[PDB]
Symmetry: C2
């Protein structure tokens, strides 16, 4: 039985993108997080406004993001996984922010959200694809009779891990590991590989 391997993106294969981008620009106002502004829509509108006040159009943003690299060992891990499973990346970021990083991973299929860009290359809005997108994606693959094995690093990955046939926690905080013991928790790509092997119904080699 061929399985689909669903991987979260940020914190699993690449650094948290917005935060790294903000740090690279040196603009303190771009660094607010959900802790500073809990309402996600309010946080996003602010980000768009500050980006515009500083003249950072999409091209400028992607230029900065292109200097980021996948986490050490992530490139080999994705290659390893693609020799054994059909690989799909699920992410709560936007196509426009992830692109320079996806390129470095060989553009594996990515299901995430999308920014609204005007004719002057300005980021003017955003669109969330649907509610609980990672979980709904797993459901879609189950509709095609696939067994799904998923891996993620945060609480925002737990509905995906719960929906999959097998879930694995990677670099997760103790807060999550303790609450979701049904998911093996590891923090090295080698151990992550081993968990995918144990979760598979097929006999695969390391």
């Amino acid at each position: 039985d061929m399985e689909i391997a669903c991987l979260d993106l940020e914190g699993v294969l690449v650094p948290e993108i917005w935060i790294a981008f903000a740090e690279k620009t040196g603009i303190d106002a771009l660094k607010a997080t959900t802790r500073d502004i809990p309402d996600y829509d309010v946080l996003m509108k602010q980000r768009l406004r500050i980006l515009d006040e500083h003249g950072l159009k999409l091209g400028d943003i992607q230029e900065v993001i292109a200097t980021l690299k996948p986490l050490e060992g992530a490139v080999e891990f994705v290659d390893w996984l693609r020799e054994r499973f059909q690989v799909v990346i699920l992410s709560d970021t936007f196509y426009e922010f992830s692109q320079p990083l996806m390129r470095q991973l060989g553009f594996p299929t990515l299901l995430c959200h999308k920014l609204e860009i005007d004719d002057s290359d300005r980021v003017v809005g955003y669109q969330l694809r649907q509610k609980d997108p990672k979980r709904q994606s797993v459901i879609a693959f189950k509709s095609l009779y696939y067994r799904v094995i998923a891996a993620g690093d945060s609480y925002n990955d737990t509905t995906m891990l719960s929906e999959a046939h097998a879930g694995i926690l990677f670099h997760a905080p103790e807060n999550v590991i303790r609450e979701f013991p049904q998911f093996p928790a590891v923090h090295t790509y080698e151990d992550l590989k081993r968990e995918f092997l144990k979760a598979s119904s097929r006999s695969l080699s390391l």
Copy 2:
């Protein structure tokens, strides 16, 4: 504005695997396709029987498939497509038979069928994933709010082409083209790129 490019595999990116396997090994009986035998289940039972009678185990089969390559220009086309869309391959091939070719394409997500391999590495059976598999795959992406643009080369791709938001016939036989006038038909990869640009709701460049 969220789009998935679904591509058929054989005829579109790589040669028909069985016809090429026959030309390599000299086993003419393996040239048969659904044109010769309409029931994929019967044709499959026959193909497995012949492989066995020729002592061809899975490892042996793959050594041969590894000598095949993608159609001229297909790799470059997939790379072009992956910079602009999320690319998923929909095929009636089998994972174990197509792997060497899929690796050359950078292992993009492949939704196809699987084989039953025994202890002695013999291909003793197969399992078709579900009925009308390509059409159902398109429906699955629709369930995630994606717009789908599909490309295929034959009669067996038409349910997929009709279900998609936009369908393109590529390298299709004249008969298929004539019977399905609703889909633009092109024969070069540059023209295929152009059809993906026309079908997209986004401003993309060639």
